[PDB]
Amino acid sequence: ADSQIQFTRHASDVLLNLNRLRSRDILTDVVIVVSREQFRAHKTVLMACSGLFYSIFTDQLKRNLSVINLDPEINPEGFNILLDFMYTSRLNLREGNIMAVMATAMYLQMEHVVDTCRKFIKASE
Amino acid sequence: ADSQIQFTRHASDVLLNLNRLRSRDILTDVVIVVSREQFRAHKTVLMACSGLFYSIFTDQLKRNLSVINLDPEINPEGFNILLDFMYTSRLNLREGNIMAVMATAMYLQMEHVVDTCRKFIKAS
């Protein structure tokens, strides 16, 4: 019964605006603590990209936490790269960082990223 | 050596997952009341699509309201169709609601949707 108009750039515009909200710290509602470091983010975005975060915020004792500590074993530069991805679509992979990037994606239960890390050490010795 | 990979279906998969959260009422943080109807949503999604909602949740007396009442003149069906659009990309229009949809989009300061409505008044 409806004429439906799909806006092919909507999803990207939305994601772009979510990133501006992030970097202006608007409605951010949680801090992710990774060893030293702190990353402000929106819980819903986290939950929309990782089933790890989904399992966390879906716990009624944890829904309303405003701070979340990750595994001490986790690399802060790896998580920062994954966090920017989640907000931008762009995974910035270096020869220097890729090690921990992949351990993070794995930890954050995001295989499509794991797989592009493996599919990246094609350009390898 | 150095690199940057863009996942082209990522934005799309995020939006898809945001809409499942909504449809399961997971982390929704506001109810929008439009006459006698109520719609649960995520404030960040609202602010990421509508200029009106950006201003509401950016006023610090309102940032943390969990109920927002739209102007009484706003139509529940028109609102529903825009909220679905925010969460899916799909604007579902019919001849018997297209003008209400357009009025609502003006109010929510989503002007490209308004132009699309106007422009979809070719056949007609």
């Binding site: 499509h112 592009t116 | 082209t8 997952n17």
Partner: peptide
């Protein structure tokens, strides 16, 4: 360094159950 494109879908899909 170079910007490349991936068509990979996300493995993470929020359930509906």
């Amino acid at each position: 360094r170079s910007e490349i494109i991936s068509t990979a879908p996300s493995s993470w899909v929020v359930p509906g159950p």
